[PDB]
Design a protein around this ligand. Structure first.
Ligand SMILES: C[C@@H]([C@H](N)C(=O)N[C@H](C(=O)O)[C@H]1O[C@@H](n2ccc(=O)[nH]c2=O)[C@H](O)[C@@H]1O)[C@H](O)c1ccc(O)cn1
Ligand SMILES: C[C@@H]([C@H](N)C(=O)N[C@H](C(=O)O)[C@H]1O[C@@H](n2ccc(=O)[nH]c2=O)[C@H](O)[C@@H]1O)[C@H](O)c1ccc(O)cn1
Lengths: 693, 693
């Protein structure tokens, strides 16, 4: 039909296990796509599911990959376990002995970057054969290499070294569909291929987004698909668990134990609370599910292209919304016009992913998350009236409004954290010295200077340099801040012990831990509340001061005729035309005489200019935090101003009463959020328990 | 001789004026160079001067150009006036009726960037004809297009619009030699072509470096050549005067009046004082002269290549000396082994250049000068022992040692200026409020906050952004600092008036102006001491705080198979070889099975890493200035520390006595330098007067 397709046989060694035979199993199809992802249908491209005597009707998985090795891809593919569980499911109206026919997509990204040890595994499965890729077809550049087949072998064990494949009477067929882009176009393009391309052909019911390296549990995909029984749910997500290795031998890295605790409390407290209202801020791209009908239309338009209505110039939201990439989908689904979709959190389905283990990789990873969450929250709050233009009933609309206000309260608290941390630190360290005089004077001065030097260097290195160039310094900074936090804990314990012997710093901070602990107990998963709490506490002054500074200082990732030839022989003789005619010489001379007598750059450069002027206006964050510091501590010359006024009608005081008032406000304002999230987690568990009963 | 040369005739219209005839005048020579600049001789390349019956012996001009229009190049070429003066010179042993035969080079830089309205002028002179450039010759890429001729027409007037050429009995011949590089290789390459190339062929006596747009006076080149009568002088330079337009109608821009005053005091005070000792730190590249024998060897090696002795890794001086580009020549000439060359300043020869007129262009220009001077001074001080290994007598060696120590004292004063300015500002503004209470409290706080915000924004914008993107902000910053300086002057005048009615701020600062004025009077050029003093005073808080911050924050200018094809007919049928043999399929499958079973980047990136780690260690300047601020004002928690100590055996004081002591030290330390430079200028003028008498 004007398109290039090919159909090769597989190696007879595969046939040896396959016999232990239809046209689906013995052959593979290589369609080569050259068009745009949004044209597969009208360019006469098909897939094997639409070719049979009765076309197959798909019920359910996109696995994005870039350069992951074969162990990560093996883990994702092994998590085949879900498909096997779903065929062996007996008492069901949707799944049964032939369930695999209703489940189908591995989107690679560029041939140069792909790890050929993973192409090895894809070929072992039988979904790729080298030899017949075609880098252009009839003056049209190929864009996609689509291999398809239907294997019989399953990954059954994964050591640290090898992936074990087998083909028995107990394995189940898998309808693989391997897409190979010839070039890296970033993840958004891959999702573009998955949603605007093959999803329009297959017409699935649910689209589940996995991520190479993420291993769903033995039932997790089934438990996620069960969330969509409710005809209102539009998206869903499950728990993401840090992979702690064999014998939990990766819970030693303090950067991995920190992330384990952080993920675990994010799931227990934040996600259940959000799911009560009906709008989860981010559905993780490593393990999420969308009802296809829910996202078609406005959500995908906003995700892939952006706010289309725009002039030639740049606008804030329209030209910056690309920084909140996969979080636009959630907001546009929940607030869709004339539809009542909601987002649900399923805690019965988990997936264990791999986390960064070195400080530079970790910083670069969180640079994306922090900018995405900040821009997404600003967009959600500045556009929350859309909630009232949607189709929900009035109760749900009120709940969503309350949740949006609570989420903005949280983002504001997080914006003022640079100053909250310093103020708590300096108020506490000066107060202990004023109380006891012994050696806390010198430590107060020393720690002020250490904080100042580390913060100065973090601004300078993040604005100018790159984390890979200077890793020793970032490790040293994290160690310095850990020691500072230890000193803060010692000071609080000392002050409280002496005060008891002779106060609210224990009634508020103790509640936050007791409430954290009780929420973990309610969730029936408390084992992180001791193995990894200390690392989080110690690596927490660095999540406030190093990841935030780097995140805001690197918002946008800026990036600032042949008129002759002479060939001669060994002798060196040749000739060409020479402008011999003196009239033409005079003509050229008069041309230059008259030339003497006749007395914005690229859109890319203009866009880079705009992007770099918006990264430099958000940092100048610093002023609004210093305003708080100056008001409370009376820095900035304000105390001098008050003293001079008193003289006009004197001496400056060491520590004032604004410090006490503020340092109470922060402790109770951080106890309040823990209280709210504990109540939310309790409601979630209780409602789930009644519905299960 | 294996090289491509060509010899075209000129237009007969030129012949019309030339008649009003030898082979030098009627023809032009286009040699095309493809080799390296240091190979012109042994590759059998010549110039017309070596071809005559008796080869010409050159006595004396390289004019670097990039994209200057035809007015600037016209001005440089007009300043032909010097050659005419030198032929009409009667009573001389070197110059006479045929002096032009001893004077010869215009080094363009790339055909793409050259302003074709200047190619118009070069063709009007008769030294370029389009039609026979050859972009490659016998598998060798052309590197240089060398046109040569010997004109008769002279530029006699330059309006704002046109350049007036004429050919009479009164004009004089000029031996032009137009070099056109096919690509931009930066100025260092052009000087490489000028010195290592054509200068080895011509063997001149003096090499004078002009720069397109700079117009030497009617006698300036002759007066510069006269400095080399002394067989010890190795280099020389003249005064550079800002071009103030017709009717001085450019002395209105405050950025141009500032630069006029700055250039004028640099010439009067700095350069005469340096020339007394015998070592001028920078000979400006816009108008300088070097005795060719003086610079051959070590100076040119260090200028063009660098400290050759080096390992694979990077070292500070060896790998950063390229930032001090034309200042290495001076240091290496003066301290040359077994030679007693000195550098001399000639005030009888001037040249009027064009200056930047918008803040972004000005900032980008001074970014080069400040980094160059800082690295050159560090290199000169860290290597000053070389002075004692040279050939000078002991008196000159002692004088050079004293001068080197004085120059390091100056560079240290300039390194601590960021803190000196703030300390003077805050001590003065707080002191006036403590004295009079009226409305100086509020102004003290307001100006502290304005200073803080402008300095924060200058760090952030210079570390992240570019000056062209944000020009409104830099203009606003300069205005803010001008207002601050006005307030500083008001405060000092008010305090002094009240103190006289009831002190050293007038005996020191008044001396600095009286000494500036007296030096200008001695120099017989005082007219800048009123037309442009106010602009310099007001635009001076910005030379300390905006150009220095930008200069140190931008030290180094960082910059971070086809395996198929298918063509078919309209029907779409074709065939190629297919790996049909199943044995080869099994072979490939086993190849991937075994692939599964088998379980630093570019030198440019490493160099960029090193460069960006050295720009980030020099800024972290900030700490050593803040140490001074903290010691004097008792910021940084030191005053709190003292108060807590006093309690351990209380209240903080507003203003202490360290402020008074420091604020005396700065005023007298800035009066001392003015005194030294006044004495130096006086010695220079007096010695020149006796030698002239
Ligand atoms: C981040 C995620 C996982 N560790 C991961 O790395 N995800 C990548 C990503 O987020 O970009 C995926 O993107 C693909 N990719 C990369 C470069 C490219 O150029 N194109 C392209 O497609 C990569 O191969 C990879 O599969 C982690 O588990 C997680 C996420 C959310 C959460 O709440 C908790 N945990
Ligand atoms: C700066 C100088 C003059 N205004 C100027 O602009 N000099 C350029 C420079 O310093 O680079 C020259 O360099 C050439 N150039 C440029 C780009 C390139 O890529 N390659 C290349 O050769 C340009 O054409 C130009 O002639 C000014 O008068 C001055 C200097 C010192 C001083 O004490 C007082 N005043």
């Amino acid at each position: 039909n004007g398109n290039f397709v090919f159909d090769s046989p597989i190696s007879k060694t595969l046939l040896d296990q396959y016999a232990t035979l239809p046209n689906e199993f013995k052959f593979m199809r290589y369609q080569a796509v050259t068009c745009e992802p949004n044209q597969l249908a009208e360019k006469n491209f098909t897939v094997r599911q639409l070719k049979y005597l009765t076309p197959r009707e798909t019920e359910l998985l996109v696995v994005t990959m870039y350069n992951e090795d074969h162990i990560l891809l093996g883990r994702t593919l092994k998590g085949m376990d879900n498909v096997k569980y779903m065929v062996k499911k007996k008492n069901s109206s949707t799944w049964g002995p032939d369930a695999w026919k209703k489940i189908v997509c591995i989107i690679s990204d560029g041939r140069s970057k792909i790890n050929e040890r993973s192409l090895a595994l894809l070929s072992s499965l039988g979904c790729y054969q080298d030899g017949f890729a075609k880098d252009e077809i009839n003056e049209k550049k190929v864009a996609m290499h689509v291999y398809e087949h239907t294997t019989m072998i399953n990954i059954t064990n994964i050591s640290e070294s090898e992936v074990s494949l087998e083909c028995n009477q107990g394995t189940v067929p898998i309808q693989l569909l391997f897409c190979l882009k010839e070039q890296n176009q970033k993840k958004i393009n891959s999702h573009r291929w998955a949603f605007e391309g093959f999803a329009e052909l297959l017409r699935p019911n649910i689209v589940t987004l996995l991520d190479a390296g993420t291993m769903p549990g033995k039932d997790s995909i089934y438990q996620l698909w069960r969330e969509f029984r409710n005809p209102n749910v539009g998206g869903a997500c499950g728990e993401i668990r840090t992979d702690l290795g064999k014998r939990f031998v990766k819970l030693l890295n303090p950067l991995v134990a920190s992330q384990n605790f952080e993920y675990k409390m994010s799931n227990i407290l934040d996600k259940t609370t959000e799911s009560n209202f009906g709008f989860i801020t981010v559905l993780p791209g490593a393990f999420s599910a969308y009802r296809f009908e829910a996202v078609r239309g406005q959500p995908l338009q906003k995700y892939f292209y952006g706010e289309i209505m725009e002039n030639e110039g740049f606008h804030f939201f329209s030209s910056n919304m690309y920084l909140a990439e996969d979080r636009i989908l959630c907001f546009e689904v929940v607030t869709k016009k004339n539809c009542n979709w909601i987002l649900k959190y399923c805690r019965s389905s988990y997936a264990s992913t791999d986390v960064p283990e070195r400080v530079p990789e970790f910083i670069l990873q969180r640079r994306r998350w922090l900018n995405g969450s900040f821009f997404a929250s600003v967009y959600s709050f500045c556009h929350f009236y859309r909630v009232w233009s949607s189709g929900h009933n009035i109760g749900r609309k009120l709940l969503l409004t309350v949740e949006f206000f609570y989420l903005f309260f949280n983002t504001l608290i997080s914006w003022f954290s640079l100053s909250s941390f310093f103020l708590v630190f300096r108020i506490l360290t000066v107060s202990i010295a004023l109380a006891y005089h012994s050696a806390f004077n010198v430590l107060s001065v020393i720690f002020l200077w250490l904080y100042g030097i580390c913060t100065l260097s973090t601004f300078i290195l993040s604005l100018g340099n790159k984390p890979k160039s200077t890793e020793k310094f970032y490790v040293l900074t994290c160690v310095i801040f850990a020691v500072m936090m230890i000193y803060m804990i010692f000071c609080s314990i000392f002050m409280s012990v002496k005060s008891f012997q002779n106060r609210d710093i224990v009634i508020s901070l103790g509640s936050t831990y007791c409430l954290y602990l009780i929420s973990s107990i309610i969730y029936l998963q408390p084992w992180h509340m001791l193995t990894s709490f200390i690392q989080y506490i110690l690596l927490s002054p660095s999540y406030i001061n190093v990841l935030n500074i780097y995140a805001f200082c690197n918002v946008h990732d800026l990036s600032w005729n042949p008129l002759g030839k002479i060939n001669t022989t060994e002798d060196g003789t040749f000739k060409m035309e020479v402008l011999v005619s003196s009239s033409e010489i005079q003509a050229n001379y008069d041309k230059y005489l008259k030339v003497l007598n006749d007395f914005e750059p690229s859109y890319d450069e203009k866009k880079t200019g705009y992007y770099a002027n918006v990264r430099s206006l958000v940092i100048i964050w610093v002023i609004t935090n210093f305003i708080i510091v100056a008001v409370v501590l009376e820095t900035g010359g304000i105390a001098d101003y008050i003293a001079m006024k008193s003289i006009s009608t004197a001496e400056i005081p060491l520590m004032t009463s604004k410090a006490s008032i503020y340092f109470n406000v922060i402790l109770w304002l951080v106890a309040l959020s823990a209280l709210i999230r504990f109540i939310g987690c309790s409601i979630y568990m209780i409602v789930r328990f009644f519905k299960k009963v």
